[PDB]
Amino acid sequence: RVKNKNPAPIQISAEQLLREAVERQDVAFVPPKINITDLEELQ
């Protein structure tokens, strides 16, 4: 009936906001490492 004015059992908290905002980050970008197969690219 989408009219559930009943106060939520879990109220939104500020620390929750900052935590779930930070959660948007992931691991450091992983690039496929370059393979030095010969001497010139090593140089």
């Binding site: 989408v2 559930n4 004015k5 009943n6 939520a8 939104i12 906001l17 900052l18 779930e20 905002a21 930070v22 948007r24 980050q25 690039p31 496929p32 370059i34 197969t37 690219e41």
Partner: protein, 50 residues
């Protein structure tokens, strides 16, 4: 429990805002470095396939 729907929109925008950091135009330099890395990888891959 369902506090309408515009509040969800503003909550999403606020969540994106609070953790965005990194300034505003610092997003250009890292992107340029990524593109240069991609182009040099393409050059090297072309050389090795040659």
């Amino acid at each position: 429990i369902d506090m309408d729907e515009d509040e969800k929109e503003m909550l999403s925008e606020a969540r994106a805002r609070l953790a965005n950091t990194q300034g505003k135009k610092a997003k250009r330099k890292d992107r340029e470095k990524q593109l240069e890395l991609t182009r040099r990888l393409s050059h090297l891959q072309k050389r090795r396939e040659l």
